[PDB]
Design a binder for this molecule. Structure first.
Ligand SMILES: *[C@@H]1O[C@H](CO)[C@@H](O)[C@H](O)[C@H]1NC(C)=O
Ligand SMILES: *[C@@H]1O[C@H](CO)[C@@H](O)[C@H](O)[C@H]1NC(C)=O
Ligand SMILES: *[C@@H]1O[C@H](CO)[C@@H](O)[C@H](O)[C@H]1NC(C)=O
Ligand SMILES: *[C@@H]1O[C@H](CO)[C@@H](O)[C@H](O)[C@H]1NC(C)=O
Ligand SMILES: *[C@@H]1O[C@H](CO)[C@@H](O)[C@H](O)[C@H]1NC(C)=O
Ligand SMILES: *[C@@H]1O[C@H](CO)[C@@H](O)[C@H](O)[C@H]1NC(C)=O
Ligand SMILES: [Ca+2]
Ligand SMILES: [Ca+2]
Lengths: 177, 539, 539, 177
């Protein structure tokens, strides 16, 4: 486990706000996180576009199963590790590779669950605004520990621990160690 | 001296030509380095491949040969730049060494770290032009940037397609993408910056720039874009029925098979000169051979793709000139008075028939666009009807698509800077009533005023033109450096110092009015732009 | 004094009231002189006849009674003057003695040859108003002209018709013509000139003027016409469906016999109060009871009639105001912003259904008149949508018909002078954003500012208002004297001295922009006027 | 029997030009004129509207028959006295009364002839501009003697004999006495 940030009672949210003049857009998305919790329903990682754009990326645990749901503009595509229980209290790592509409999810060394959506789907994640971790505002606060957040060449917890000028943690989210 | 720089495929020898003017530093020119394998035989009608390494040092001192073309034939004269149509002989002087082996590019290094790179995508249309006509040496010596002018396959050899898999098409776009890849992975050796590469072109070449934005092939190759007097949504930007003209050319050339693959092979068996000289006339205000919507380079029509945010946030600098349809009124441009009403109505009806031609309704559309484009305060002027016809062509073909694409690019929080050009070079044959026509900003961008009149531009350039050119290349080089035409270098030798260029917000369509008297204006021809974008679709 | 004059029907004794202002001479008022027999019995719904001679001297000192009218009813509130509806309770003071024998008139004689006469036709709509409101005594003593006002049958008693010979209609027009005949054959005794009779009016009364020009009956009675804010070709000037409203009224009042003669005979036996006080609702932007095209007084459709030059070369002085549809935007006059976006395409849509209602196509007309009447540089202003709605109504109902009539009267070589009124009196109940509304020029023409505020006009008049009233009064009196607004009397007590009011030629539509900054402009709202006259018919 | 203007060899013409600001338009027309001639084909009285308007009134002798043709806007309504010959050298007087489309032509003491054209017709004679007597410019020169040209309360020949400013004489027009 890398830089471990804990989520205690009451929850919280850590936000990375991209600079207004340097908002990135990308065809392919990459995600990786090592989480430890027992919450049946929660939201761990949420990525939002700017104002007026419906594209979003959401990592959410529903009924104890973690899943990735992204809306790139046409429709929501959701992939879930349905045949696996993850909220056992241990440290579980997950990776999520996105390319166009296609998406692959890997858990530790367990077999990868892939998804190749049919039909015409959009491929661009337009003008990402903030990285949201904690999911309290959506309605599913996350209580647990998080480590090793990699997102398209960005290590969020690392530069959060490095006291970057565009990171804000509101709540009781404490650094482990 | 004769500086030698080692590339990733070999070593090249440049020159150190010194400019005529005084304040401009020496420029090192690597005229003629290659960037792809020459598509001569079986590789013809195929996407380009990486070049072949050479042993030793290769001369880069003479201008490379141009790609095959037919200047003295049947070309679309309505979309070509005015300075290219007027000086046809001086233009054909440059295209004399035409050969199928032409995939070469020229770099102009000057003599706050690595210098930015500016690629120039030339081409008034897709059937003519070469990169040797624009001596991008004053621009490099002024803005401390590296100007790169390329040569790509044009016309039949670069854009022939059948819609099928036998001939996908868009080989010119793939050549441009290969040149961008070569610049990205080789410009570090020349002192350039592979992370600040801009692409800027005029005319239909600028269309390529726009078509290079909606393509996943050019993802990280370039960072910015400057599309002047060109869009990917005008009538003559892409070709929507390529088979109808490919079959016509094949039939006229001698072999018209019913199978695409064997017809493509038969065409590959022909010589590069025989099929270039052949005359295939397209429908008016359209193109015969050009970019084709296939699914690989251009996934769908550029109008649909750019609406649903299929681009990767490129800083953009769009602009238009005031009157560009100067060749729309050319059959009635040498008269004491303008266009008589019996001819104004005829021209408008022909316009509607050629462009829209919608059988659903035309007696309503023709009347309303006749009524809109006439000044009723001076209805019986006659002379000021050429002005309204010129405005009609300029508004439909250039101003409206440029404003639409600027709004669409600015609706996804990507910077857009809009400019309008009013000043023009005072030529000899250019009419007094006419104003800045198509491609009449290229001399100012390239520093022609600061180097003297050339064979392509025979105008007399005063001190006003020199100052305007200095300011224009200052803006362009500032955009190349950082993406904001105001921050790097303050304006200096004037009304150009106190004007601050502002972004193009969709709600408040702010723009800058480049000319004798600049101003940051608020809305450009909002009435006619809104007419063409919001009313005509309802008729 | 207490002067007495000998008319052709007897002698009438008049009064000599002196005006309040110190720059005006005494005025002799003869109020209540009859001009026709009183249509009470079988003479109802019949054209008027000449009066009956009376032995002795008739006392003409008290204002005559008004015609029957239901002020507290369903009056058309769009066509009425603004000051009438604002001071509706104060206006009802003048109309309180409503009697069926209202056919009277009143002259205001003043005290370089003989004196001209100016008859005033009143009526904002065809069912209200009386001539006692406009005390034309200030105008008489200023321009040395004889101002005459009258009372004519209005509403059902005046314009009821069915189509056949049972009830032709237009009895109010015939009463006006009878009054004109009385002036023609009896004004010599009073000191007037029976060959210099101007006839002017504002609102629907002005329409009567434009129907007294195309009328065979009034050939030599008058020579000049001043039609301010009124035409005979607008939507609410004549009634094209008289039988429907007549039958509905007959059914409502108590007897609707299937034979027209029987129903008319039953109506003739009913008292005026029980049939005036009915509630017959016309379609929006139309009238129920009004002038009807029969063949006697109005030979044919006024739009068709005046295109073929069916008039006798009368000098004309037409005018409009800046914004007259102030009561079109009435549901959105007490809002901080203007109108909503969904509330702008609702008023326009209702406008289209009420007026045009064509089944051939209305999704083309609505879209184009919604695109034309909006400011594209301030697309989301809000207030500049209330402004454009007011401009839309003013252009359709008041400006386009006025320009059409002026052009069709100046095509046949008759001197037409066009004017536009911009200044207005700052009232209490009117919005600040508003401008000179319908009927807001009447106080200046009648000299109200030079006498002080009255019950009908409680506004505050400054020196500018008095100067403008004097200027417009001088123009009107000069037109009455010689048919040329600037010939006899130069401007006196300013920018009005050096401006020369020019004619209205159909090629260069010159007009005078009457206001605080007068200047002879060249074209009044050319774009919208041409849109309503030349494009809308094509759609 | 009043003032007499006699045409001579070649031809002549009398032109009355109404003032530009006092051109009359009338629904009723009256034209009385005494003539003496022996020409078979000629035109005597021609009244035209202003420039552009096609309104006209023309009195002409053709094949020994005298007739008036007027255009009020719809069609050229022409009434001709056919059952008589007038160019026999004897003095004649002709009267023409027009109201709307209806016309009445009388010569000497023979019974009048009435024209009542059918259908909807225009009435107003718009903006009379000039009176042409003799028709030298019309194409048929007139040779003879004319007297007492009465037109809607106006006597053109009477005014001509007193050196009227608006009256123009061109050709071989001679005055008797
Ligand atoms: C996504 O999957 C489809 C399924 O065949 C494939 O054609 C497409 O190439 C994939 N996307 C990318 C970016 O390779
Ligand atoms: C080009 O290459 C030749 C080959 O030897 C060499 O002699 C010459 O100096 C080079 N440069 C030129 C011709 O400018
Ligand atoms: C421009 O320069 C040329 C050559 O020096 C000269 O002939 C011409 O008169 C000049 N002025 C113009 C073209 O207005
Ligand atoms: C006429 O009016 C005057 C003034 O009011 C009055 O003295 C006189 O008695 C009146 N005469 C008649 C007959 O009404
Ligand atoms: C009119 O204006 C004057 C000031 O010139 C003021 O004293 C007076 O009260 C005003 N009248 C009204 C009715 O507002
Ligand atoms: C002409 O005569 C007909 C038939 O008598 C009549 O109806 C019509 O009114 C007359 N025209 C005029 C202008 O009086
Ligand atoms: Ca999207
Ligand atoms: Ca006529």
């Amino acid at each position: 486990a890398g830089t471990t940030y804990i989520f205690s009672k009451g929850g919280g949210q850590i936000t990375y706000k991209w600079p207004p003049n340097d908002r990135p857009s990308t065809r392919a998305d990459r995600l990786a996180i090592g989480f430890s919790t027992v919450q049946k329903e929660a939201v761990l990682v949420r990525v939002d576009s700017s104002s007026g754009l419906g594209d979003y990326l959401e990592l959410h645990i529903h009924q104890g199963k973690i899943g990735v749901k992204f809306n790139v503009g046409t429709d929501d595509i959701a992939i879930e590790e349905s045949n696996a229980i993850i909220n056992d209290g241990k440290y579980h790592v997950v990776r999520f590779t996105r390319s166009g509409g296609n998406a692959t999810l890997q858990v530790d060394s367990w077999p990868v669950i892939e998804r190749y959506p049919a039909g015409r789907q959009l491929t661009i994640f337009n003008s990402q605004a903030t990285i949201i971790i904690g999911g309290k505002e959506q309605g599913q606060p996350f209580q647990g520990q998080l480590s090793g957040l990699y997102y398209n060449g960005l290590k969020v917890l690392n530069m959060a621990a490095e006291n970057d000028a565009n990171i804000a943690i509101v709540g009781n989210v404490r650094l482990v160690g | 001296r004769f500086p030698v720089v080692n590339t990733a495929y070999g070593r090249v020898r440049g020159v150190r030509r010194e400019l005529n003017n005084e304040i401009l530093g020496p420029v090192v020119q690597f005229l003629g380095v290659p960037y792809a394998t020459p598509p001569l035989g079986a590789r013809r009608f195929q996407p380009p491949e990486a070049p072949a390494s050479w042993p030793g040092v290769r001369n880069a001192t003479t201008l490379p040969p141009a790609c095959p073309q037919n200047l003295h034939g049947a070309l679309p004269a309505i979309m070509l730049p005015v300075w290219f149509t007027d000086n046809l002989e001086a233009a054909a002087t440059y295209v004399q060494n035409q050969s199928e082996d032409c995939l070469y590019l020229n770099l102009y290094v000057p003599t706050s770290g690595k210098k930015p790179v500016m690629l120039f995508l030339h081409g008034g249309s897709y059937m003519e032009g070469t990169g040797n006509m624009f001596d991008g040496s004053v621009l490099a010596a002024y803005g401390n940037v590296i100007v790169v002018t390329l040569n790509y396959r044009l016309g039949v050899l670069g854009f022939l397609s059948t819609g099928d898999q036998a001939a996908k098409g868009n080989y010119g776009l793939l050549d441009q993408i290969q040149a961008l890849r070569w610049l990205s992975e080789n410009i570090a050796h020349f002192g350039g910056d592979p992370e600040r590469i801009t692409i800027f072109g005029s005319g239909a070449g600028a269309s390529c720039v726009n078509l290079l934005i909606l393509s996943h092939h050019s993802e990280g190759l370039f960072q910015k874009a400057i599309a002047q007097s060109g869009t990917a949504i005008s009538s003559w930007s892409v070709n929507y029925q390529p088979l109808k003209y490919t079959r016509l050319l094949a039939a006229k050339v001698g072999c018209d098979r019913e199978d695409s693959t064997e017809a493509v092979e038969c065409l590959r068996r022909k010589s590069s000169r025989e099929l270039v000289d052949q005359d295939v006339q397209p429908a008016r205000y359209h193109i015969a051979f050009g970019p084709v919507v296939d699914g690989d380079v251009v996934p769908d029509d550029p109008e649909i793709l750019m609406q649903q945010g299929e681009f990767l946030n490129y800083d953009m600098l769009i602009g238009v000139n005031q009157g560009e349809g100067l060749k729309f009124v050319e059959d009635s441009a040498e008269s004491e008075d303008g266009v008589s009403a019996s001819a104004f109505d005829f021209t408008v009806s022909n316009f509607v028939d050629n462009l829209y031609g919608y059988p659903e309704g035309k007696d309503v559309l023709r009347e309303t666009i006749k009524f809109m484009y006439t000044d009723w305060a001076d209805r019986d002027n006659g002379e000021m009807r050429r002005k309204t016809l010129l405005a009609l062509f300029t508004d439909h073909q250039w101003v409206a698509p440029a404003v639409a694409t600027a709004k669409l690019h600015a609706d996804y929080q990507s910077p857009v800077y809009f400019y309008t050009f009013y000043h023009h070079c005072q030529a000899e044959g250019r009419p007094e009533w006419a104003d800045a026509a198509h491609g009449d900003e290229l001399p100012y961008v390239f520093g022609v005023p600061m180097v003297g009149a050339t064979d392509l531009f025979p105008c007399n350039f005063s001190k006003n033109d020199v100052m305007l050119s200095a300011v224009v290349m200052t803006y362009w080089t500032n955009f190349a450096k950082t993406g904001d035409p105001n921050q790097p270098v303050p304006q200096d030798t004037n009304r150009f110092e106190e004007v601050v260029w502002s972004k193009f917000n969709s709600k408040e369509k702010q723009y800058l009015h480049i000319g004798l008297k600049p101003r940051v204006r608020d809305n450009y021809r909002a009435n006619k732009v809104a007419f063409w974008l919001e009313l005509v679709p309802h008729l």
